[PDB]
Amino acid sequence: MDLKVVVSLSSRLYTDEIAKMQQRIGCILPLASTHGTQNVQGLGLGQVYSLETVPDYVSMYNYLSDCTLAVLDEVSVDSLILTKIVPGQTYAIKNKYQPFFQWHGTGSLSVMPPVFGREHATVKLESNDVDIVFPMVLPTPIAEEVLQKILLFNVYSRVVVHMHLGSVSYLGHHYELALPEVPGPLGLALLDNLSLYFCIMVTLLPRASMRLVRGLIRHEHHDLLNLFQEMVPDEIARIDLDDLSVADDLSRMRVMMTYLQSLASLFNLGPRLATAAYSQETLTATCWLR
Amino acid sequence: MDLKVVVSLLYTDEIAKMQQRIGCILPLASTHGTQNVQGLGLGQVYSVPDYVSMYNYLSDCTLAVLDEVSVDSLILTKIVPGQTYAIKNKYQPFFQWHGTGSLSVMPPVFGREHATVKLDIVFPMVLPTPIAEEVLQKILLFNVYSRVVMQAPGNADMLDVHMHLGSVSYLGHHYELALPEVPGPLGLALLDNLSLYFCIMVTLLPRASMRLVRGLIRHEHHDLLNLFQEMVPDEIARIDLDDLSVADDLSRMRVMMTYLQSLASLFNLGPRLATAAYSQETLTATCWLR
Amino acid sequence: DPARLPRDTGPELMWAPSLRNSLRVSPEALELAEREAERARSERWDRC
């Protein structure tokens, strides 16, 4: 099987843009089509992420799940070549991303809209008067942390604690990320579906576990319990006044675990990469699409 | 392609107890040719038991059905998502399989002495998906109901929690479970912290739900269902507190978000095997990684 | 247990909001008709 997409630039390319693109060899890039040759429009995440002030991250996710994925291997003047990522093949994906997230041994990678700025992960192509930006590829737990930090800033916007939320923290370094103000109707639709999920959670949640944790806060102190500050919440008081019954609890848990799988799939936006055998000395990982 | 993994290390009782299990699976440490003894299944993770790290180790590292056992070597084949395989249900908690039912692999919850071979080797439990989520619910609520009656014996009765958790039922197969009647408090058991995760997310779900519903209703109307599903919960958990420290509420929301995502990935049953043609005559099942 | 919505259009489902399941009410015209018909009712009493 031959996976080689040559993208002919419609104009030339200066040496500074060539030297800037040549540093980003091995980084994941999306494509418009899956065909043999393509033009430069549609390449990268730049067609949905215009040169504006306002971002929208969930629309870039809806782009990224829609489009295909490719890795940048050869860039020349007037033409640069890409290697597609089709499910079923196994690829060597190098860690050539500037906010250096250290990768786990046989963990799971995850592509991402550029959360650390437009100017950070981009190449300015004045010659073809377009912009190619590069989607971030970070491991899946830190990706979940970034996604939930974005949603938490989306919900806390009508309240205000900012730098305690607007900066991700990793063992390599803690990083700031760009915080928009409104995701339009799509981020609010994602919050709508997650609001449905959360409200139906607080409908069907069991009561014996609250009766566990109310006495348990009074019994034990833990790092799972320090955030309550040794104060049982009042909802635990005004729900635990009822009795305990195991039959309705098993009826409740048969919908709890039924809904939590779909809630887990409400965070699988953006395609996911399953990696293996990442060497920390060559910064590449034998990885394939999940 | 070549697929064998020859691990080098037995005697007649070891020969017998390994030849009983010539169709079961176990995880490895690497996808390479020759391995040591320690890199075999679940030795370094089950000796204090804890379900979350065992699930992380089972989903992280690869898997391998073993084929033959010599006096000194164990010729085994790793399973890759490319081609298909054949496995057997030769496990000490015996669950009868069925055709085209998804098979899961969970870490052994029914005792270390049940699923092991003492020369060490620990095989993970292989059992179908609806029985998997059923026994997971029935050990979670068993831990909660045992801990509350070790806290307060007047909350529930020990016989009342045992007529519905001492047995599972799928497709008429009415199985039974081995429950630890003496778990011992302050954790220190298997499934001792997953219930401690479940109670924290159940506790923090109302504080998330009120902040999330009130945060979205001023986003006037994206859909009906931000305000349609306000009627379905009880009104007691609706108007609970509405005044708290924004940093403390932020930490509570973030803690419940990460404990929700980890528990949601865990309640997704793990590395799911998809069988095709089970035959209870030969006790074999044509499966593949899915 | 009701819920409040601005708009929709044209379902097959019977219990589903729409523009065709909207009652065409005018408060001004009905109130004037009422106020005038009330006057007519008042004038109806004093013929007997």
UniProtKB/Swiss-Prot annotation, chain B:
One of its GO terms (molecular function) is structural molecule activity. Keywords: Capsid protein, Host nucleus, Virion. It is found in: Virion; Host nucleus. It comes from the Viruses. Disulfide bonds: none annotated. The keyword Hydrolase does not apply. The keyword Endoplasmic reticulum does not apply. GO terms for cellular component: host cell nucleus; viral capsid. Its main location: virion. Pfam families: Herpes_V23. InterPro entries: Herpes_capsid_2. Structural component of the T=16 icosahedral capsid. The capsid is composed of pentamers and hexamers of major capsid protein/MCP, which are linked together by heterotrimers called triplexes. These triplexes are formed by a single molecule of triplex protein 1/TRX1 and two copies of triplex protein 2/TRX2. Additionally, TRX1 is required for efficient transport of TRX2 to the nucleus, which is the site of capsid assembly. Belongs to the herpesviridae TRX2 protein family. Interacts with TRX1 and major capisd protein/MCP. This is Triplex capsid protein 2.
Curated annotation (Swiss-Prot), chain C:
Residues 1-45 are annotated as: Interaction with major capsid protein/MCP. It comes from the Viruses. Signal peptide: none annotated. It is found in: Virion; Host nucleus. Heterodimerizes with CVC1. Interacts with major capsid protein/MCP and triplex capsid protein 1/TRX1 at the pentamer vertices. Interacts with the large tegument protein/LTP. Belongs to the herpesviridae CVC2 protein family. Capsid vertex-specific component that plays a role during viral DNA encapsidation, assuring correct genome cleavage and presumably stabilizing capsids that contain full-length viral genomes. Participates in the interaction between the capsid and the tegument through interaction with the large tegument protein/LTP. This is Capsid vertex component 2. The gene is CVC2. The chain holds residues 10 to 57 of 570 of the full protein.
